[PDB]
């Protein structure tokens, strides 16, 4: 299969009665349902184009960032993706200015390296308060930069799970000339994002489907097996 449409079963659909004309090419006239659905053919060619583009960028060792700040399910999953193939990720939001420079990143990553190479000796040799504080900023570097500790430079690409859930992220993305790929809903704005992905994110099934799509795009790029999008097996994974 190649992102087969038969498997596609909860990608059409989103929240009700908040859409804008920017999605007018994505939605047919509505009376039957009122829960804004999508068009199958258009999403198919758009997703094929996105897959081909990310693979082509990814042969030359491009860097991709993931927005891991939706509940838990997609979060732990994209944690797994960002871990087996080692690239940058986050588990918490940007606090603003997280993607604008590197000095705040550089001093932070040096602090992390010093911490991991130092506290491996100290558990009770220093004060108890020292142990608690060091574990605290361990947790802190895990919250923000334990998902990103390998930047030669800020990532060449990124995926946004939901832009109307991460206005700030797509804002800094549009500030820079960096190419941008992001999911799109009927509340999102597919006029500031560079790559359109008209897929739902409220239901975790769609999130994990596009999740596997990107994971397989980045996997075959660096000679890694491909669990879906080339496997005729219908994606079996169920919600938790």
């Amino acid at each position: 299969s190649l992102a087969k449409l038969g498997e596609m079963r909860t990608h059409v659909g989103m929240v009700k009665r908040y859409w804008n004309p920017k999605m007018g090419f994505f939605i047919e006239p509505e009376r039957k349902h009122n829960n804004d659905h999508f068009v199958l053919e258009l999403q198919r060619q758009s997703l094929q184009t996105a897959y081909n583009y990310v693979k082509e960028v990814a042969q030359n060792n491009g860097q991709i960032l993931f927005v891991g700040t939706k509940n838990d399910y997609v979060k732990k999953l994209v944690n797994n993706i960002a871990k087996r193939v080692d690239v940058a990720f986050i588990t918490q939001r940007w606090l603003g200015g997280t993607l604008t420079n590197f000095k705040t990143l550089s001093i932070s990553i040096n602090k992390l390296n010093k911490l991991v190479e130092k506290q491996a000796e100290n558990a009770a040799d220093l004060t108890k308060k020292e142990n608690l504080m060091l574990s605290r900023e361990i947790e802190r570097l895990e919250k923000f930069f334990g998902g990103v500790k390998s930047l030669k430079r800020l990532p060449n690409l990124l995926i946004v799970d939901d832009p109307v859930y991460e206005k700030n992220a797509v804002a800094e993305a549009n500030i820079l000339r960096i190419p941008v790929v992001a999911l799109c809903n009927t509340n999102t704005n597919p006029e500031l994002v560079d790559f359109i992905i008209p897929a739902n994110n409220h239901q975790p099934q769609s999130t994990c489907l596009l999740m596997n799509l990107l994971a397989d795009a980045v996997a075959e790029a660096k000679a890694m097996p491909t669990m879906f999008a080339y496997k005729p097996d219908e994606e079996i994974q169920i919600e938790i």
Partner: peptide, 5 residues
């Protein structure tokens, strides 16, 4: 257009 290198 894609193919960013």
């Amino acid at each position: 257009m894609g193919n960013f290198d």
